């Protein structure tokens, strides 16, 4: 009875109409005989489980969070990008309490779902309430990101892990001991049913082989060495950190310098990575109220040594160093004191790239190849064993509104990550330089050459 259990549970693909629904009664157990027993408290409580059936799980890192999402990936997006729209959206699950994770197997096992029989149906149809966002931002545990929309005024974004992308990636990466990197979580019945089946292990997408760097108005920041960053760039892939983290680094480097010179305005930024070193370190979370630690998780981290070449609209030494930003995706970023000689600006790209020392790194260029799927990704990850996938932008789920609690007094919408493939150039100057692009339904850090 274990293979019948896995076949209805959302991390196995799907599947003579009387054996099924008399098994579906018997998956609330923790047969035809107890299939006859009709508790009025069993029929009314089984309706509560579809009421917390959820599209995108807000409880995915932090099981303390609080909110219900039954919505669809909003919009459409080009071929080289990849979100929870391009994969057919039907693997959904239960995101509520651990009391009802087996009693949710009668009406949420889903090709579609099962969402005095007539009396039950009348209440269910009225409250079925599909396409639902019920999140309040103040007394819970959500991420929050300010990103600029148009010329001025930022938008707050709370990324939420989609369930149809997780169970997609967990199934295709079974046979691959090389492109898969497992993260394990604890107290997994508080997570949801889509985490019970895998047992807590989630089988992410690792960036293939190792990193090896071959020899390779423009302000040059050399040897930005981040010690402990995050490799969880998406809830789906691990590797080099996301490209909204390298953008938010520069637009904190801009926005500090706009205290003195109010028209600085970096246009684009060239990234030259040496020495990734992705690794599972630890994260001792802080004691939180009965006073003990919160739930134990697993965290990947990376130790980047990159160098950065900007593109300015048009400055002392000591103005730059005190106005560097000090965190690149949770990790402390620093320039050594002896490397402060190399912060000088230039005028031509061919001298600015010959200017910086420690030459042996790869510039980041997006692999703009039509893709739609993980097999579309993995096929390009073997012709280039150095191709690394990560998060490139945020795919929204509703339009940004006024909320009573928002990140820094802006308009807030809920987003989801977008996964693209990232090249490496030996050195098309425009293609190398990245910038923030706003799409009425997403926001993606693209190169200039797209």
């Amino acid at each position: 009875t274990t293979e019948l259990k896995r076949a209805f549970r959302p991390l196995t693909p799907h599947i003579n109409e009387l054996d099924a629904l008399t098994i579906l009664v018997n998956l609330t157990d923790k047969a035809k005989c107890k299939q006859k027993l009709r508790d009025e408290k069993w029929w009314a409580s089984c309706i509560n489980c579809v009421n917390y059936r959820q599209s995108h799980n807000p409880k995915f890192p932090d099981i303390r969070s609080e909110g219900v999402i039954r919505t669809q990936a909003l919009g459409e997006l080009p071929s080289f990008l990849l979100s929870s729209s391009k994969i057919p959206p039907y693997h959904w699950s239960y995101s509520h309490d651990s009391k009802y994770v087996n009693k949710s197997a009668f009406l949420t096992n889903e090709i579609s779902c099962l969402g005095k029989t007539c009396k039950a149906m009348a209440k269910q149809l009225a409250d079925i309430t599909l396409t639902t966002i019920n999140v309040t931002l103040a007394p819970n545990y959500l991420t929050q990101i300010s990103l600029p929309d148009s010329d001025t005024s930022y938008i707050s974004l709370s990324p939420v892990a989609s369930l149809s992308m997780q169970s997609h990636f967990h199934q295709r990466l079974q046979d691959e001991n090389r492109h898969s990197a497992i993260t394990r979580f604890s107290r997994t019945t508080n997570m949801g049913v889509t985490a019970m089946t895998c047992g807590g292990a989630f089988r992410m997408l690792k960036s293939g082989a190792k990193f090896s760097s071959p020899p390779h108005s423009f302000l040059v920041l050399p040897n930005i060495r981040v010690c402990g960053a995050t490799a969880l760039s998406s809830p789906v892939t691990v590797g080099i950190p996301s490209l909204t983290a390298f953008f938010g680094f520069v637009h904190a480097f801009e926005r500090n310098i706009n205290r003195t010179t109010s028209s600085f305005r970096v246009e684009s930024f060239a990234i030259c990575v040496h020495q990734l070193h992705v690794e599972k370190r630890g994260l001792t979370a802080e004691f939180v109220e009965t006073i003990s630690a919160p739930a134990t998780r697993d965290d990947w981290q990376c130790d980047v040594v990159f160098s950065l070449i900007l593109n300015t609209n048009f400055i002392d030494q000591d103005t730059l160093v005190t106005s560097l930003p000090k965190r690149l995706a949770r990790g402390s970023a620093k320039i050594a004191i002896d490397d402060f000689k190399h912060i000088n600006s230039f005028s031509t790209l061919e001298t600015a790239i010959e200017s910086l020392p420690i030459e042996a790194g790869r510039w980041l260029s997006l692999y703009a190849q039509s893709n739609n799927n993980l097999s579309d990704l993995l096929a390009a990850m073997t012709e280039d064993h150095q191709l690394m996938a990560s998060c490139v932008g945020y795919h929204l789920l509703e339009e940004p509104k006024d909320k009573p609690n928002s990140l820094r007094g802006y308009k807030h919408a809920i987003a989801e990550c977008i996964i693209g493939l990232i090249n490496s150039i030996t050195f098309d100057p425009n293609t190398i330089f990245w910038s923030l692009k706003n799409y009425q339904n997403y926001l993606v850090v693209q190169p200039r050459s797209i």
Binding site: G228, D298, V321, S332
Partner: protein, 338 residues
């Protein structure tokens, strides 16, 4: 004074990882390496001989309990013909304690900001900058490595600086107390960097620290090691050149700079600065919230700490240690919601 439902600061002190190197006696510097090697110990666990009721178990006889117990550990040691080990990190003090990172209430946002300009006026950053800097200059950030060694030297390299790289030679002998750090040639040129940092709207004060550990022959080193969910002691590592090298964390380091708290009702040892200040030798919470001297029962008294510092009288030690502990948690940062 009631707390907002959004309150957070960034951290004011920002460390990095600690790399380990090996200095050969021909002054050739090679990064430190390690290996995993399997061992075989006894079968002591107190669960393998005793059951849950505490009664002796009947499966594990005299023979079954003397059998063999193979396990694997990462093993890092100092190479043979080496001389010493150069452990180097870098700090920063950017004064992020000035305004909050996130706050919804503007009445409350005045109260925490007007405490600080009442603090550097009335008490000033002499006391805390004395305390943080006496964790860089001695061997707190080296952790277990300082223990069981011959001698260790510390060398600073500050950034807004002119000449004479600051040296600290032979700790455990010279630099034992507070006054012995003051009697250095340039100690008050460096406390006036942290004081300049916290009191400026943008004051920065980079350091660049480098230790030198003279170990015994062929000795162990103890880096920080990972927290996951086979190998039972997996060290943290970073790629220096082409070698794997054991490091000490960016959070293992910053917990050593911030062991300050001896302001609790019964303080015999300094504790890491945090809400309801915890100890991990004995798993207890000094400054438990029922005692009423935790951090959330000081923000609620932050209004009373404006009429205290506005009085011309010097306030007592009972009610400026709350002011020192209030500052050390705003330096530490973190969400303050309730």
């Amino acid at each position: 004074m009631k707390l907002p439902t959004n309150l957070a600061y960034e951290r004011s002190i920002d460390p990095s990882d600690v790399c380990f190197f090996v200095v050969w006696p021909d002054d050739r510097k090679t990064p430190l390496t390690y290996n995993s090697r399997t061992l075989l110990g006894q079968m002591e666990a107190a669960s393998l001989a005793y059951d849950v009721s505490g009664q002796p178990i009947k499966s594990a006889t005299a023979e079954a309990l003397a059998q063999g117990n193979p396990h694997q550990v990462d093993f890092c040691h100092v190479p043979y013909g080496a001389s010493h080990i150069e452990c180097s990190f870098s700090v920063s003090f950017s004064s992020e304690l000035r305004q909050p990172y996130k706050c919804n209430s503007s009445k409350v946002k005045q109260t925490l900001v007007q405490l600080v300009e009442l603090y550097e006026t009335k008490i000033g950053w002499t006391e805390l900058a004395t305390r943080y800097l006496m964790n860089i200059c001695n061997g707190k950030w080296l952790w277990k490595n300082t223990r069981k060694a011959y001698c260790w030297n510390i060398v600073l390299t500050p950034w807004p600086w002119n000449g004479e790289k600051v040296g600290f030679e032979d700790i455990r002998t010279n630099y034992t107390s507070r006054q012995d750090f003051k009697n250095n040639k340039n100690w008050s040129a460096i406390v006036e960097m942290i004081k300049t940092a916290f009191s400026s709207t943008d004051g920065l004060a980079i350091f660049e620290v480098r230790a030198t550990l003279h170990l015994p022959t062929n000795a162990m080193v103890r880096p920080s090691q990972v927290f996951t969910e086979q190998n039972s002691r997996v060290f943290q590592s970073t790629t220096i050149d082409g070698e794997r090298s054991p490091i000490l964390g960016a959070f293992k380091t910053g917990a050593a700079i911030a062991t300050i708290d001896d302001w609790y009702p019964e303080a015999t040892e300094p504790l890491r600065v945090g809400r309801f200040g915890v100890h991990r030798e004995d798993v207890t919470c000094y400054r438990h919230p029922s005692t009423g001297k935790d951090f959330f029962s000081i923000l609620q008294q932050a209004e009373h700490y404006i009429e205290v510092l506005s009085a011309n009288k010097t306030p007592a030690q009972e009610t400026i240690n709350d002011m020192h502990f209030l500052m050390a948690n705003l330096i530490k940062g973190g969400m303050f919601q309730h």
